[model samples]
Target: YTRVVWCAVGPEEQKKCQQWSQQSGQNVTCATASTTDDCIVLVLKGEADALNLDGGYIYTAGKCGLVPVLAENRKSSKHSSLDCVLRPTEGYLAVAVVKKANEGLTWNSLKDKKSCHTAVDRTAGWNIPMGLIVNQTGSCAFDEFFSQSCAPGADPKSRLCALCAGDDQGLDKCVPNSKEKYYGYTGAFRCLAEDVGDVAFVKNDTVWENTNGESTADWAKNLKREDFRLLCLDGTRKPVTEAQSCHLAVAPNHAVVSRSDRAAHVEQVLLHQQALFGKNGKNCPDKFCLFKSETKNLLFNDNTECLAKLGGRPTYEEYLGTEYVTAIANLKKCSLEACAF
Candidate 1:
């Protein structure tokens, strides 16, 4: 059975159009032509299950007496068919069929909205409703927040919140000025902190091993470019004792140090703090460090659950603060040559 599948395209996006045809069943011949008149001429003759056509072509086809097989709801003009071509072999053609029941569609729409909200919330580093349970202030923040523009199918609440790490206030609202001063990441975040008043200068505890099989007892001596370390108030920077510098193994990898000043300092403090807190506290008792935006590539001890499940890969919708903090700790141990930033 030859069925026509219609898609929408805007006038401004005409250059992306493809004159293509496809069938939903196996072993069918499909082809495209230059204009809707040509597609109509070909589609009438070409035996196929589905026409798989652009909206512009479909509109023209419908005018010529070809009714759309899947036309419960009208296809809007804002949609675009980026890639349209003829497939030789047809296997399983999966498609989303939006239900027509008002309640069903409304509920599904709400769920979709919630999922998008969850994704954006995760991106901003808050667990959302869960984050609210952790702190009521966090919950209200979501309710009161708004985004300038939401992506198609994105939750209306996806960009909500004035204080979520990526919102208007972002990290500045959560990160105390005093804390920035204390950690000495103010001004240029990853540079030397010699000029900062009363800046903490603990001994680098992590060691650096050169690519040529040379291990330096002192991390500072190896500090030509990539020298990284974890240092504490007690002036120790070794991963063995400091425990703040976490290590992750990569295939054929060189240890890249995270040189962010705040990240490095937080790495050291978080190590000791997590030990002291030990799952019994609401928050870290040691001077609390405001969490920064984490990179998608890094992982942390706190992420052991996600890592153990083999699903810790970062997505467009996940936050990586812990990973960023730990990455800086590892980066601080690099020698000048080992350091890239």
Candidate 2:
């Protein structure tokens, strides 16, 4: 059986992959890996096939000799062709959102506020926002800006993790491990909605998807888009929907990746699987929908409309476009102590 490495953080996500394996009729078997780094290792050792990864991980996987086979196309009016994969226009925008009641806050006056982030180095949550801050502040002392923060991957004792509310057990509150409760897009939004943070750095769709009864989660079920506002660089605030005009940065979309030698086979299997379980597929009207995710993005982003051809792009730098690559490169330089602003 062909083993596909399903990179997932918890049992819930693993169970979903297991269901996909059973439904695949033995054409492919799913093997669970706890993290993206581990999944990369499995693929490199020829023990596993592929995993859907975020843009940041795509860069890392490229360096490990893996290549993107399919790209997740999130629903947007900007593109119409599902079969043709071109570099997405501006990708998704990263925005900082705050409660409308917090009228005192703006992008320029964010200092000394409580903050929430999906995780350290994540595109929307950390890279874009922090990179912009590094350019403005000329310092890595993020702890000074946010009086308290819930950046999951930051050092445990650092003030960056001081506001973290851990998982069910209340342990590993601020650890970089997935064991932390406040660790992903939804988790970061939760921190803000629950009054743990003054602002949340996340994707623009986060507020819309989680609010107005769109999400049934306790933290987001009652949220309203009108209750929050986006912080713009011009010292003004806008609604979440206006992020295109007011955002920290635009990021690259996530994609499916596999070892270079198996790219063809992996593509074949994914195409076949998509035909059966995709949003518009025959079986999707009844059951086994792949794009509808209940929890935060696990194996795939919930907002993804479909997986499309990557147009033979061989590397992350090639697929993510030049502007995004430069943004991430600037972030990497700022992240390193030797090149800190």
Candidate 3:
């Protein structure tokens, strides 16, 4: 019985993975790392078998010769009746969000403004937004474009981490985990809501999910849907409902990736594992749900319904799509560490 060793990026995920390991009868196990890059390195070194990654990180791993296994499938917004596991993956909308009160802010005038990102190497948070920014400005000095920001995974002393508020204790500022108050989607939105940053780079659903009674957390519970605006590439700011026309890019959903040698085995094991622990699974909810990790989003996105099989074996480029791949290449050509890390 071959086992899958999952790479956990933080201690929380490691803990989650350990629980999964125990519950899965050792069908899966955990390997710890501090960042996505380190986790990718673990896979390359054969110390770990796989990790789920954002499209931006998928580009990096794909460039390193990893292959896509399964995709994170969320509930359909299109009202499709197809089962979650069989549905074809749809890209998420990456949007730039700003407060309605920031009346003058537009895509054309983002220079020198404060910003918040999910993380440095994430899809909606960094690559798509910064890729567009770099393309528009025709320059690679994105760090200087933002006057101050909370972009996790940058050097802590740099201006990029300027707006990142750490945990409630203020301990791990900009550490690129849930501990950083400005770390992921909600965190970056929090940064924008608290006025720590002028704009938040997050997905379209993030706005709807975190505002208007959808989220009951103290920071987000009072947020109203109408108080925010989406920055369109044409220099106009539109209502969040207009994301179809106002967003920056459609980002590929996060997926699991592994070395080619381990791909089939990893996929087989995951398919079996999800049948037991996925949403509508045999042992989930009543027992331990592999996809349930609260807002921490450990191991997988909290919204994931299942780990769906890909239509066919896809190279990382095929999974990520051509335009997105090209955009990543364009941005990465500017900074080696941008793609590698």
- TM-score of every candidate relative to the true structure: 0.16, 0.90, 0.94
Stretches of candidate 3 exceeding 4 Å from the true structure:
336-341
Comparison by lDDT, 1 against 2, better one: 2
Off-target runs (Cα >4 Å) in candidate 1 are 1-259, 280-341
For model 1, residues 55-153, the per-residue Cα lDDT tens digits are: 222333433444332111111123433211111111111011111212232211222221112112111112212232224332433333322211111
Q: Could you say which candidate leads in lDDT?
A: 3
Strongest candidate by TM-score: 3
Cα-based RMSD of the predictions, in order?
27.4, 3.3, 2.0
- Compared with the true structure, all predictions reach lDDT values of 0.22, 0.77, 0.88
The lDDT ranking, best first, is 3, 2, 1
Q: Model 2: runs farther than 4 Å from truth?
A: 1-3, 78-90, 175-179, 335-341
Model 2 lDDT tens row, 1-341 = 25455545455567777777777765666666655667778788877788887676676677667888888877766546635334343377789999999988898888889999988767888877887887799886665778999998677788999889777888767754356777778888888998899999988888888999999988788889999999998899998779879888777777888889988888877877878888787677577877766856767878876787865565767886677667777667644112111
Error of 3 at 160 (Å): 0.7
